Design a protein around this ligand. Structure first.
Ligand SMILES: O=c1[nH]cnc2c1ncn2[C@H]1C[C@H](O)[C@@H](CO)O1
Ligand SMILES: O=c1[nH]cnc2c1ncn2[C@H]1C[C@H](O)[C@@H](CO)O1
Ligand SMILES: O=c1[nH]cnc2c1ncn2[C@H]1C[C@H](O)[C@@H](CO)O1
Ligand SMILES: O=c1[nH]cnc2c1ncn2[C@H]1C[C@H](O)[C@@H](CO)O1
Ligand SMILES: O=c1[nH]cnc2c1ncn2[C@H]1C[C@H](O)[C@@H](CO)O1
Ligand SMILES: O=c1[nH]cnc2c1ncn2[C@H]1C[C@H](O)[C@@H](CO)O1
Lengths: 230, 230, 230, 230, 230, 230
């Protein structure tokens, strides 16, 4: 159907969970979904569709970086008529009060990318997560009683950031963590009148040096339960 | 104490409601607060402090524009040790599905201002409202059962915007309304580890031409009740 | 007539003096004008119109910041057919050779705002004061024999500026003082084929720590006399 | 060794061919290399190392987008001491004189990304391919007598570009094709005193609508032969 | 003494008139100066020094463009201790009310160059002509009774401007004419605590199609007389 | 024919060598060309046309800076139907491994100018030298067996650069030298479907302090021989 997806309209559920690592998306499909079927593996992206508690749901990788997730997200909403995309994954803590293994739910994401300025006449677009998804993710966290921090995320274009002062500036403004897709995902969902959200498990801290499965599995429970709520 | 506030530390409540119109802040203090006392009138800003349901609360004008509310907000958090600032006021609808008299709760605010780029090393800062305040405002709206739309706001530097195409671009991305302070307020609260939020009543629509008291009074109920919740 | 002015065309004189502080504009109207009449008090802006030496003249507040004065200035030229706007007020000295209580006449104003780049296809717009107004202000200063410094001003969006190095950079380039409106005012006057100028009394120095009525009253004499000359 | 590579220093050859599609890198390793060994499959990236005409050589995917290839390229030069990286892949024709199935060798790449401005104090960095690699690629093309077009490439952050006029602007300036990594790759090689180049087969034209294996296999011959020359 | 000037400190007068055309500077030195001596001809720049009404004065070419005049102006103030530089020359009318052969005195100059943003922390620097020089030029014009228009100039980096809409935008904001140096000259003078100004004769109109010696000679009279006044 | 060229179509050869210094272009015409004829001296630009080894060739100055060479280059390609322009001249070494008297051939040029962003919708245009000209220049260097360094150049708008850190940043990225025109020249050639290149002799090093005729004459041999090859 598309240059990056061999599946046809209907092969994907209206709700898709996406992580950067394709092997992780496969693991997720084999571990949490019932009767998972590979609906798209163009570029080894591992796109699956199965069911969770009887409801249809798809999991697929989205590569690293805004440009990558932008291709997939726009194709999903536009062609496969997906309604909700929840980015699930890892991130790097910024805030001194955030620690490795913590789970973070993004209210929004800042970025050093130029993409949003391009789509928004060179102004400040607030890459905001859909309030419905933020609420579903937080309620799930409350119902499951899993501690989660809610706040600003930062989607960097530079994993290895030359601007070494940025980290501290972000800590001062209390950005929770850093990943590489949210800022791109959120605006695309707005454009298509759809929904997007993000939840991550801190795999490491960037301002200092600091069982990792429990954290990840807990995050998955939240994302999955929130998917059912939506 | 400051160049724009004659009051002393302690004269302001930890929660302050702010609107652009100083005469409106006076009206609010005389109408909803018990035993309101003028604590600051430098520049006729009408800063009052009284009580709502027994709890301390202050209301004060903040002028129009990011530069203005930036002066007041930073002085409040920094010097008067304020903890929560809720901007209450009017705005201009953008989205075709938003109508005059609707009440809007900002999850965040975009802007054509350069302020945030200055504070954030020329990158994209997501001026996001404090999740606590967004939730308090939404719960209040639910408890009072007052219909309210939650979503992106836009803080413009140009009430009379030369870029006439922007309005439609914003409608496409589904920005709810336009005001002139939120984008400045939110980041300052982050810097001080404090909280900020915004709720507005649409006084007019910018994409087409379309009792106004009820809407305003309803918005006030939400803001006041949410203040108690925080 | 407008969202920020209740007055009707003709209520304002062709020459309007504006300061940020509305209470100051009221003081000015009561102190220097004969038979002052409140023609607009929307948002407590204190818009008055009286006469000076028999000629019609109006005084009105303009709030703090480019966004604010932009609303008022554009409405004045456009709707109320005003011809000349002279910003009168206070500012913060930058140049080491400028001292508190000095009077400064802006030839132009630089800015960290994005407004002019928005109106000028992202290029460098030289926010220049109208030569007629600069001359009238300087002749008035010469005729009254009141020492006044003429030169560059700077309109900041950030009263509390994060970029602490800027102050010294500006001293090196010899910017006289800092305020928050001139850069916005001047271009709007150009667009409407009208005139704008600015004169301020240094209320404090930003690079070091350093009767204030005389300075202010002297500035008023210059502005008033210059208004008659125009 | 790194967050995206499980291999150890020495597992990679000093010359690495990279394409976006991981399944393509696997195909390449199985088709053109002798005794290929999987040295890194973190995130299913398919990193192989075998030999071509007796010389060591590695092939690995790099995902789509500058942010992605930036992570891999910097890790390769920095940690695995790689010396030459040749991006091999597909692209979209821009120039009216370029047709589907044509092979293009980039002299350099333009971009709408902000990455290089971040690394280069907000100025214009000319993402240029290493002259050694351009020459090796062109000589290989001449020796094999395979028609190839040499010129400017463009690395976009937006596969689905909102700025629809850009395509024509690029045709006017004669940009050959569009991909999503070169502009990021080239500067990183400069920083590490290493080499980078790019050769692509046009899989489609973006300005109009227009056996594909021959073109791809021919491109591979050029890249492989050029690798031996370096 | 410098890479672009063979003269030594003292060879130049404290006041230097500069035009783009070196042959014009030679003509000026031979026509208006008494006992002109070639003090610098590096790059055929035609730097002369003679006397006007007994006072020392130098004339020298400055090439076309901000980068060019920036080299010369900075060397003059810095090394040759020059105090005043008056750019004399031609320009292209923008404003519909300005006609070919009109004489224009710049109060300031806007620009599409990036130079000033580089020197001014990426903010808006108002390239303003020294008030002393503007006054001297205008008084000279009044005393000689030669009609001259005073206002904004524009220093373009692109004589052949791709942005064809800019011309009309500038007419709307009432920019008088276009040249290629003023915006660069003015800030350099500020930095050195020196003075700079500009006066030009419109050689053509850019918005429509419309003895040229009289205009030029009149401009020279003004510049020369103003030089004596300074 | 043009505002800067008195010559008529046909007076210029299809290949033109340009240097900043007009006196240098004259020297070149008198030293290396047979029967040189002055075809254009507007602004003392010294435009000559003669023959080298029987083939027509022109030499002309282009002033200093992108704005200057942009005027000349565009007029040459557009009006005088020139096909190839080779900038010949001096530059300042950046890279620690480059020494005074070295000859450098630009593959491309970076810049702090805004010109290319203006012509390229505010994106990153890679000012790249025409591959044909780079090859001709390098082959000539090889055939003449004259050591020459090939790589990135940098065209600055500020000979006296305020950003003192830039020099080191450029050394880190291995920019060879600095001049003031290449970045402007290359894109113009692309637009006209013509060719441009650059070769310079390092006249000094900017990072430290370090017969100059031999170097210059050698560079000329390369440029001249390369002209014949094209
Ligand atoms: O610390 C991090 N910085 C940037 N990205 C991170 C970090 N931790 C996890 N990620 C995510 C972003 C990409 O999807 C990938 C980069 O390793 O994994
Ligand atoms: O439509 C609007 N555009 C911009 N600002 C608006 C609009 N409606 C209300 N406001 C707010 C922003 C300022 O505080 C003031 C401008 O009239 O009132
Ligand atoms: O020092 C100053 N910085 C910025 N603005 C100033 C300063 N002094 C006076 N002002 C003016 C600008 C605004 O109108 C208001 C800010 O206090 O008063
Ligand atoms: O036409 C294209 N536009 C952008 N990227 C392209 C095009 N054709 C191939 N590519 C490359 C860039 C990415 O690596 C991926 C996008 O499909 O494949
Ligand atoms: O119309 C014009 N546009 C740009 N520059 C102009 C114009 N008229 C005169 N000039 C000046 C600027 C340069 O010094 C040179 C360009 O021809 O002469
Ligand atoms: O070191 C240099 N910096 C900038 N430009 C240079 C340098 N060396 C030579 N040039 C060239 C650029 C201009 O054409 C002129 C400046 O002196 O000569």
């Amino acid at each position: 159907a598309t240059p990056h997806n061999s599946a046809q309209v209907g092969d994907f559920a209206e709700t898709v969970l996406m992580c950067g690592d394709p092997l992780r998306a496969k693991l997720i499909a084999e571990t949490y979904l019932e009767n998972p079927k590979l609906v798209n593996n163009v570029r080894g992206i591992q796109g699956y569709t199965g069911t969770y508690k009887g409801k249809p749901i798809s999991v697929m990788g989205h590569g690293m970086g805004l440009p990558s997730i932008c291709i997939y997200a726009e194709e999903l909403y536009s062609t496969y008529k997906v309604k909700t995309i929840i980015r699930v994954g890892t991130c790097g803590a910024i805030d001194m009060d955030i620690h490795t293994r913590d789970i973070v739910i993004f209210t929004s994401a800042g970025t050093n990318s130029k993409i949003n300025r391009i789509r928004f006449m060179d102004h400040d677009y607030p890459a905001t997560a859909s309030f419905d998804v933020v609420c579903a993710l937080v309620d799930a966290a409350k119902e499951l009683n899993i501690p989660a921090k809610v706040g600003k995320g930062f989607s960097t274009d530079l994993f290895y950031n030359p601007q070494t002062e940025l980290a501290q500036l972000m800590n001062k403004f209390h950005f929770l963590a850093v990943e590489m897709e949210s800022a791109g995902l959120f605006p695309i969902a707005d454009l298509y009148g759809a929904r997007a959200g993000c939840i991550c498990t801190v795999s490491d801290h960037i301002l200092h040096h600091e069982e990792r499965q429990n954290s990840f599995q807990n995050m998955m429970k939240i994302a999955l339960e929130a998917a059912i709520k939506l």
